[PDB]
Design a protein around this ligand. Structure first.
Ligand SMILES: *[C@@H]1O[C@H](CO)[C@@H](O[C@@H]2O[C@H](CO)[C@@H](O[C@H]3O[C@H](CO)[C@@H](O)[C@H](O[C@@H]4O[C@H](CO)[C@@H](O)[C@H](O)[C@@H]4O)[C@@H]3O)[C@H](O)[C@H]2NC(C)=O)[C@H](O)[C@H]1NC(C)=O
Ligand SMILES: *[C@@H]1O[C@H](CO)[C@@H](O[C@@H]2O[C@H](CO)[C@@H](O)[C@H](O)[C@H]2NC(C)=O)[C@H](O)[C@H]1NC(C)=O
Ligand SMILES: *[C@@H]1O[C@H](CO)[C@@H](O[C@@H]2O[C@H](CO)[C@@H](O)[C@H](O)[C@H]2NC(C)=O)[C@H](O)[C@H]1NC(C)=O
Ligand SMILES: *[C@@H]1O[C@H](CO)[C@@H](O[C@H]2O[C@H](CO)[C@@H](O)[C@H](O)[C@H]2NC(C)=O)[C@H](O)[C@H]1NC(C)=O
Ligand SMILES: *[C@@H]1O[C@H](CO)[C@@H](O[C@H]2O[C@H](CO)[C@@H](O)[C@H](O)[C@H]2NC(C)=O)[C@H](O)[C@H]1NC(C)=O
Ligand SMILES: CN1[C@@H](CC(=O)c2ccccc2)CCC[C@H]1C[C@H](O)c1ccccc1
Ligand SMILES: CN1[C@@H](CC(=O)c2ccccc2)CCC[C@H]1C[C@H](O)c1ccccc1
Ligand SMILES: CN1[C@@H](CC(=O)c2ccccc2)CCC[C@H]1C[C@H](O)c1ccccc1
Ligand SMILES: CN1[C@@H](CC(=O)c2ccccc2)CCC[C@H]1C[C@H](O)c1ccccc1
Ligand SMILES: CN1[C@@H](CC(=O)c2ccccc2)CCC[C@H]1C[C@H](O)c1ccccc1
Ligand SMILES: O=C(Nc1ccc(F)cc1F)N1CCCC1
Ligand SMILES: O=C(Nc1ccc(F)cc1F)N1CCCC1
Ligand SMILES: O=C(Nc1ccc(F)cc1F)N1CCCC1
Ligand SMILES: O=C(Nc1ccc(F)cc1F)N1CCCC1
Ligand SMILES: O=C(Nc1ccc(F)cc1F)N1CCCC1
Ligand SMILES: O=C(Nc1ccc(F)cc1F)N1CCCC1
Lengths: 205, 205, 205, 205, 205
């Protein structure tokens, strides 16, 4: 509609997608969770697990807000992530580049809340030696901001979800636990937060 | 000719490929069809199917129209899709990025009706365990807008089409059925339409 | 050369590589031919053939012409194809993207006659079951414009040659034909022409 | 934040990422170290080794400094490396392009000190024939500036690190040594400095 | 440094990387050579060999010259090849795109001499059916400009190298010869020079 056009113009001026949208003191809080969809493969020789999953990232970008009074009907807009600042979350123990399976777009409402919900295929380092046993094998999928510490970027866990796991896989999904951690490094002076998704699974039969 | 060069200049000014061309109350209706061309391969271990198919996707963009009186010959033009808003249809259950096999162009007539017809190869998660039986295997191929809900993007199926199926494949294409659904997700007030193609196939013999 | 730089500045202005250079009624005629260099592989299970070939394409672009008296000694120039309008020719039964093996450069002369001669590797759907019989297997490689019809892009054939076929192959050429047809499609008001290269081959032994 | 934005605009002006940030005879000194994390593969037939490893690279770009007085909260920023000059370190004996696993962002402080810490998977030519022996196999990973000599880019080792190596590897990591060299190629007067990591490893059990 | 920055703004204005820098009666002479590093694979079924090699390409571009007097400490600079005119040297019998293994940078001195030294992995068509014999197998790596004849681009050989070959390769390198030819291609009045590197090798025993 004619109003979305008007809005793109206003929101786009001065906007810089390379600059994390902090405000005086307040870090950007980034809510994060992972839903396991499928375990594509297990490589018992090179110790790697190949998985497809869905990620929810949401946060508030205060530069991306508007009064609905000035833009009737416009409650939300779809925005290519290349035009937005987005959390630089990385899988700390990945051994392959993430392959994003879905359109690289984010939903953004009038409050400047942003939802990026990408589906991803990625391989990880893991001891899968236990996959053929009753105890199964346990893989940690550990994520955190690559370059923003806790006081710029405040990573928080959202309630996880296992309802998405495909029933006909050859791998039974035993469980998925979720943990938020925070540590300093001898390197930098600020602490860094991470979220680890611990997945346990075994071969059916 | 000279008129196509002219038309381009006009259509290009004030055109934003990031803004879905809705028309106040009116959602953009997107006609969608999938023609299965070839089942390339079946991974019975990891439960995936590898298919080549032709998508037919058409919709009306009203910022892309022109009075033919003013541009004598030009009845339609070929436009690189990277310059157009295109519906953000995701393959809900793809486990690989799509490989587009054909030139990434769309046709547009003077009513702003756009046709984009890519040929695509892609791998999908599927229970293929029945492939060697009479009943065969059944794969659902599920697509929907990733970010736009029903009142923004109205997805419409067109007729099932198996005429394009290669006759010399190792798999017999039993049938393809089609269902449209409007799913509600907990998060949102508005439902998101999805079109699912169900194809049933078995090894020949 | 200074005259080549002058000529660049002249041709580049107002040039638009997204507009087919038709010239009032007259279609752009495109000459096309394919010469087979090697058959790299045959996949008898999935019915695909893997080939390396050399295309010759030629057409006239009337915005690329110059007075040679005005640019002494400048008879042709090399132009990256990304800067030009190029025919949107597609392989109708390709099952992979074309991998281009040579520099993406076209030769352009003062008449505006363009020549583009890519060597290409690509995979095609084909019934190859006959590959090990004396009769051999027959693949059709079908090419045409993807969006332009007869009256906009007149595809014509140039005579085939098999002298470029590598002689130390495991596959032996048994028959080759090249034919231009003009079919209607289940949609568009106007007919679309194609050139089809029909190659018959078999294993040596 | 608001000072970050202002800093952005101030830093980009006249910044040229193709220009090495030397300053009057003083070469830009580049600190460099490699943390081996995983040995993905060993090919005893083609003599290649596949490794995942963590590069630490740091240097000073005096065009990137600012006064924290002028920019109150801002002590450091995250910059996409594609916006920066970066050392042209080449892997001398690599047989495959590097796959970068991590977000391609560098950290810059108010002194103009850049830290770039990419995780990388890459394959290298190496004699791995000794892999099955008690003596193990030895691979040399040789890096260096591809085009800048000693007096332009001063490559310096930092403290190496073995802590990152995964325990559940099927390869045992005997030793990693770390040497700097300076080689004169018969082309130039100046030498070109290279840092080399020599890792000795063998199959377990 | 201050002067490399100055020299950049100077060179970039009035530089066109699409125009071969010929002068009247003066072809751009391009010195070419190949150092074979490793034979990675031999495919006796499909008749391809897979090689890693180092190319030396050097030539002069009168548009990249400067006077060291006006740029006091600047003898040479590192320029991305994407920014420069580069010879369109092609591999005639390549069956795959070349994988460039090293940074895509060229050294340019003040007299306009350009040096470009890429490391490359590429697959070539070749009769390797004799790789198991005493007589060995012989491959012809044929390179030449794809669009410039002798009077525009004068391809010349430099003396090659074999010392770069790896001694633990599974293949014993026997010999490498160099030959510069001039072909006429009947389409064209002017001849087209190529450089061919003949290499003979065998499995080790
Ligand atoms: C651009 O391409 C689009 C896609 O093909 C073109 O679309 C169509 O235009 C049709 C009319 O020109 C339109 O027609 C039917 O339209 C009505 C149904 O909603 C219906 O009222 C019409 O009946 C007509 O009714 C009388 C009584 O029988 C008929 O005799 C007349 O033919 C009337 O036209 C039509 O049945 C159709 O809906 C529309 N398709 C889409 C997908 O929008 C569009 O015209 C093209 N532009 C140009 C300039 O060619
Ligand atoms: C825009 O999006 C945000 C995030 O969904 C909305 O915030 C939530 O609204 C629910 C319902 O009122 C609350 O229970 C949550 O506490 C809110 N979450 C957050 C992160 O604030 C926000 O209200 C939306 N704005 C509009 C105009 O609806
Ligand atoms: C910016 O980062 C640099 C690099 O860490 C800091 O510099 C060093 O300073 C520490 C003490 O703070 C010394 O121990 C190191 O030897 C220095 N390293 C180098 C190579 O310079 C610097 O402190 C930071 N700048 C600011 C303004 O905090
Ligand atoms: C530019 O190239 C074209 C194609 O070679 C030249 O073209 C035409 O004239 C030739 C005989 O003089 C014919 O052999 C060609 O078939 C014909 N081509 C077409 C499609 O028109 C033309 O001479 C060249 N221009 C100049 C000035 O040399
Ligand atoms: C720029 O580079 C060229 C190539 O190295 C330099 O060239 C040549 O000069 C040498 C002596 O310095 C001669 O021995 C070579 O025969 C000659 N070869 C070539 C390629 O021309 C040249 O001196 C350099 N220019 C400057 C300004 O130093
Ligand atoms: C990148 N690193 C911190 C920075 C930092 O450590 C660092 C900074 C400066 C110098 C040396 C190291 C920032 C937060 C993430 C953390 C990641 C972890 O190191 C790491 C390294 C290699 C593989 C996996 C994980
Ligand atoms: C993305 N989601 C809807 C929105 C939404 O969920 C959502 C929106 C906002 C907040 C939280 C969740 C939009 C339409 C598609 C749907 C997709 C499905 O989740 C899904 C995800 C992964 C695999 C299969 C299916
Ligand atoms: C693309 N199509 C014509 C255009 C058109 O059909 C079309 C145009 C507009 C709307 C609907 C259909 C142009 C000529 C090629 C033809 C292709 C063939 O369908 C096809 C489809 C899928 C695989 C192989 C071949
Ligand atoms: C690129 N070369 C030096 C320059 C130079 O040699 C050279 C420069 C100009 C002319 C002739 C030779 C710079 C430092 C690296 C060195 C690379 C090594 O040769 C090499 C080539 C191929 C594989 C492994 C190693
Ligand atoms: C491109 N061609 C010459 C030009 C030319 O032939 C040509 C020019 C104009 C019209 C028709 C043919 C220029 C020099 C290289 C040569 C390439 C060789 O043909 C060739 C083609 C395909 C695979 C291997 C080799
Ligand atoms: O793209 C946008 N905004 C936007 C997109 C689509 C719409 F319909 C309306 C919009 F406002 N932005 C990029 C950077 C900030 C905003
Ligand atoms: O590119 C176009 N339009 C266009 C393309 C090719 C033509 F021959 C004529 C045209 F008008 N657009 C991109 C943005 C708006 C339309
Ligand atoms: O110019 C074009 N179409 C076009 C686009 C890309 C190509 F490669 C070739 C083309 F012809 N048109 C102008 C009228 C609409 C189509
Ligand atoms: O690139 C060119 N033209 C061109 C290229 C190389 C030359 F030596 C001289 C030239 F004129 N164009 C792109 C758009 C139209 C011309
Ligand atoms: O992008 C930047 N700087 C930058 C990035 C992110 C921020 F939040 C703030 C910044 F200043 N540069 C590119 C070239 C020069 C610096
Ligand atoms: O980028 C450059 N030149 C260049 C590179 C590095 C330097 F330190 C200084 C330079 F001038 N060019 C691209 C077009 C012409 C040269």
């Amino acid at each position: 509609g004619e109003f979305q056009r008007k809005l793109y113009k206003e929101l786009v001026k001065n906007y810089n997608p390379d600059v994390i949208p902090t405000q005086r003191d307040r870090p950007v809080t980034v809510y994060f969770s992972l839903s396991l969809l499928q375990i594509m493969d297990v490589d018992e020789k090179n110790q790697v697990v190949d998985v497809v999953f869905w990620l929810q990232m949401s946060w508030t970008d205060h530069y991306l807000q508007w009064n609905v009074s000035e833009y009737p009907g416009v409650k939300q807009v779809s925005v290519p992530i290349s035009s937005l600042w987005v959390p630089d979350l990385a899988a700390y123990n990945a051994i392959s580049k993430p392959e994003v399976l879905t359109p690289q777009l984010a939903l953004v409402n009038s409050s400047g809340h942003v939802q990026y919900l990408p589906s991803i295929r990625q391989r990880f380092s893991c001891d899968v030696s236990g996959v053929d046993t009753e105890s199964g094998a346990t893989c940690k999928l550990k994520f955190g901001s690559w370059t923003h510490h806790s006081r710029e970027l405040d990573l928080q866990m959202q309630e996880a979800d296992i309802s998405g796991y495909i029933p006909y896989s050859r791998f039974e999904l035993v469980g998925v636990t979720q943990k938020r951690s925070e540590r300093f490094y001898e390197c930098c002076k600020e602490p860094y937060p991470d979220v680890t998704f611990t997945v346990t699974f075994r071969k059916k039969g």
